[PDB]
């Protein structure tokens, strides 16, 4: 077997020419040279099955990105395992590889407006492919938006993903949550478990942001502080957004503050372009049902450049694991894997 930094790096004779990349987010990945397509691609090794969080997650994202298929939300390739669930350690999940992400490309390039507008319209355009599916991505940020040479753009990571529950919305204030910090809605902090639409629509608000400073718009440093930097530029809510807060906790957290003004956004962002900060600031609304849904986000006039509803494709096939234990769950990846097997 193939060794990389001293560990297995198993992915056979089809897969050679291996280079190490870093440690993603549930283990190691590499490029290799895919010897049937004739291209290199990016391969991470998964080793879940000691933990049934991780057997979840794992599962998850399989059985989500092999089902969907669109241009702007990252394939499997191919997965690679033991023939045999006794024999079946590791997994590994080939996908196209993308030179750069959001992430590492907002750290030292500034975007044209062109590119704003473009990286939008594609974010968007995955995101109602997603929605359409009534799955949830919830985890949003830079670097799960992979680009291409010629910046083309692919949603990644679909192992915090959920099937949306609005009904099942509402939770008490300060209730943890997994997903990350600096692309959290208000409402996760108050009273939101994150299983509608509008969570995800927050997350590219922040993004957008993002794209037109380089910098985080809400780097809170901590959980609570998150709130502060969100209130700290939207300002105190209003009473009726307050009045849509039923939970008396976090009702009374808000009330307690005292009064901040909203920064205008063209004061924080004084080269944006004005349709692009009128689309931001509904993004960015504070009351969730007020935010803008991912198709008016398309149809806005920031985006009237690329806006084409029948080049946006939907889902033809919309979606318990929360307590099957792990020896069932490796059962069920063994199975979602097999179609990969000669
Ligand atoms: C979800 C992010 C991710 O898997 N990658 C980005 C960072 C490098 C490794 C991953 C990659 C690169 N090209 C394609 N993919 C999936």
Same mark, same amino acid.
């Given at each position: 077997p193939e060794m990389v930094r001293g560990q297995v790096f198993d992915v056979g004779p089809r897969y050679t020419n291996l280079s190490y990349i870093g440690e993603g987010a549930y283990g190691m990945v590499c490029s290799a040279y895919d010897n049937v397509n004739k291209v290199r691609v990016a391969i991470k090794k998964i080793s879940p099955f000691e933990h049934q969080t991780y057997?979840?997650?794992? +599962? /998850?994202?399989?059985?989500? +990105? +092999? /089902?969907? /298929?669109?241009?702007?939300? #990252?394939?499997?390739?191919?997965? #690679? /395992?033991?023939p045999t669930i006794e024999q079946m350690k590791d997994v590994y999940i080939v996908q196209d590889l993308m030179e750069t992400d959001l992430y590492k490309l907002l750290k030292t390039q500034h975007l044209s407006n062109d590119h704003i507008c473009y990286f939008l319209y594609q974010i968007l355009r995955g995101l109602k492919y997603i929605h359409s599916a009534n799955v949830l991505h919830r985890d949003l940020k830079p670097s799960n938006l992979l680009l291409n040479t010629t910046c083309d753009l692919k949603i990644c990571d679909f192992g915090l993903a959920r099937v949306a529950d609005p009904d099942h919305d509402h939770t008490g204030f300060l209730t943890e949550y997994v997903a990350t910090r600096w692309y959290r809605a208000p409402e996760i902090m108050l009273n939101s478990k994150g299983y509608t639409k509008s969570i995800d629509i927050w997350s590219v608000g922040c993004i957008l942001a993002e794209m037109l400073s380089n910098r985080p718009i809400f780097p809170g440093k901590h959980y609570l502080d998150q709130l502060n930097h969100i209130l700290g530029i939207l300002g105190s809510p209003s009473q009726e957004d307050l009045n849509c807060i039923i939970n008396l906790k976090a009702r009374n957290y808000l009330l307690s503050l005292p009064h901040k003004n909203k920064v205008p956004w063209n004061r924080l962002f004084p080269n944006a372009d004005s349709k692009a900060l009128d689309l931001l600031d509904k993004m960015l609304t504070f009351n969730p049902h007020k935010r803008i849904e991912v198709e008016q986000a398309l149809a806005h006039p920031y985006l009237e450049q690329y806006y084409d509803p029948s080049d946006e494709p939907i889902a033809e096939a919309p979606f318990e694991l929360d307590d099957l234990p792990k020896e069932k769950l490796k059962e069920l990846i063994f199975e979602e894997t097999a179609r990969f097997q000669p």
């Amino acid at each position: 077997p193939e060794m990389v930094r001293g560990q297995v790096f198993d992915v056979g004779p089809r897969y050679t020419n291996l280079s190490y990349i870093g440690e993603g987010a549930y283990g190691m990945v590499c490029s290799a040279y895919d010897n049937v397509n004739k291209v290199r691609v990016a391969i991470k090794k998964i080793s879940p099955f000691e933990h049934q969080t991780y057997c979840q997650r794992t +599962l /998850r994202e399989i059985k989500i +990105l +092999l /089902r969907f /298929r669109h241009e702007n939300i #990252i394939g499997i390739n191919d997965i #690679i /395992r033991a023939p045999t669930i006794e024999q079946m350690k590791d997994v590994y999940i080939v996908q196209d590889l993308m030179e750069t992400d959001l992430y590492k490309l907002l750290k030292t390039q500034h975007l044209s407006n062109d590119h704003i507008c473009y990286f939008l319209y594609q974010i968007l355009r995955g995101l109602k492919y997603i929605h359409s599916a009534n799955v949830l991505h919830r985890d949003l940020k830079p670097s799960n938006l992979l680009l291409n040479t010629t910046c083309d753009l692919k949603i990644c990571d679909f192992g915090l993903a959920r099937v949306a529950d609005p009904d099942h919305d509402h939770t008490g204030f300060l209730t943890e949550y997994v997903a990350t910090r600096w692309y959290r809605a208000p409402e996760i902090m108050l009273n939101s478990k994150g299983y509608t639409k509008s969570i995800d629509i927050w997350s590219v608000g922040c993004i957008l942001a993002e794209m037109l400073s380089n910098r985080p718009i809400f780097p809170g440093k901590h959980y609570l502080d998150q709130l502060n930097h969100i209130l700290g530029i939207l300002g105190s809510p209003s009473q009726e957004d307050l009045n849509c807060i039923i939970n008396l906790k976090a009702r009374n957290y808000l009330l307690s503050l005292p009064h901040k003004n909203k920064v205008p956004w063209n004061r924080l962002f004084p080269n944006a372009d004005s349709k692009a900060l009128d689309l931001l600031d509904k993004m960015l609304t504070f009351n969730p049902h007020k935010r803008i849904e991912v198709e008016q986000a398309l149809a806005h006039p920031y985006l009237e450049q690329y806006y084409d509803p029948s080049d946006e494709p939907i889902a033809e096939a919309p979606f318990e694991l929360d307590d099957l234990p792990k020896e069932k769950l490796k059962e069920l990846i063994f199975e979602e894997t097999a179609r990969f097997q000669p």
